[PDB]
Design a protein around this ligand. Structure first.
Ligand SMILES: NC(=O)c1ccc[n+]([C@@H]2O[C@H](COP(=O)([O-])OP(=O)(O)OC[C@H]3O[C@@H](n4cnc5c(N)ncnc54)[C@H](O)[C@@H]3O)[C@@H](O)[C@H]2O)c1
Length: 203
């Protein structure tokens, strides 16, 4: 049983309460604000180097370490369900130009390929994992929607309060996290792939 927020106002209230207790340092807050502004770049370099930051510029090394350290203070007090929208490349290079048909309709053969490749398997993510307390409108229209089941006590931080962007109810998860894809199905209208996954641990 994992808590699933169905109302933005309640999600925010719960999130705000958690944020108030983190006691993040000035440096950590600064690194988090920056991460919401450059997430794709940061996560990209992390995946590109498989988590090895030695070669990153000094400031980035500093920011990654600050982000990682921040999680010493951020844990979810309960089992919670988190959401995320992903573009085709999330499934791999081979899906970039094949997952979708000409009208936003998921190509069934591609779906089967993706299923064979990920269904009931473990997946390791090198970058940080940006998620939301709800399937927020901004990312809810992506072709791949994932529902993460995160266990009580796991590293997870509601950073929405200091994020540079609004309406994302962001719950950030640590880099080098591994999760297990439990379910993969086409949505009612055949426009999305809904993924249900169980979050594990980090490095
Ligand atoms: N995606 C969400 O639902 C979500 C939720 C809350 C906050 N945000 C935020 O929005 C921006 C984050 O964007 P992102 O989340 O889209 O960045 P990302 O680092 O997670 O993903 C960047 C792009 O690469 C793709 N991708 C993800 N993992 C991949 C992998 N393992 N291999 C290849 N491609 C991969 C994604 O689908 C996406 O199109 C930041 O401002 C952040 O705060 C996003």
């Amino acid at each position: 049983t994992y808590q699933e927020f169905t109302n933005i106002d309640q999600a925010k209230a719960w999130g705000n309460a958690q944020y108030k207790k983190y006691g993040l340092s000035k440096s950590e807050k600064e690194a988090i604000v920056s991460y919401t502004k450059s997430a794709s770049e940061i996560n990209g370099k992390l995946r590109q180097n498989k988590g090895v930051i030695n070669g990153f510029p000094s400031n980035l090394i500093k920011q990654v370490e600050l982000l990682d350290k921040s999680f010493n203070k951020m844990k979810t007090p309960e089992n919670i369900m988190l959401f995320r929208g992903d573009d085709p490349a999330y499934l791999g290079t081979e899906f970039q130009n094949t997952l979708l048909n000409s009208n936003g309709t998921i190509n069934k053969t591609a779906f089967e390929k993706a299923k064979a490749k990920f269904l009931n398997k473990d997946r390791l993510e090198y970058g940080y994992i940006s998620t939301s307390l709800m399937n927020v409108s901004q990312f809810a229209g992506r072709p791949i929607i994932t529902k993460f089941k995160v266990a009580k006590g796991s590293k997870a931080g509601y950073i929405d309060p200091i994020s540079a962007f609004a309406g994302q109810l962001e719950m950030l998860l640590p880099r080098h996290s591994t999760y297990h894809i439990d379910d993969m199905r086409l949505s009612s209208d055949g426009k999305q792939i809904i993924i249900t996954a169980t979050m594990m641990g980090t490095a």
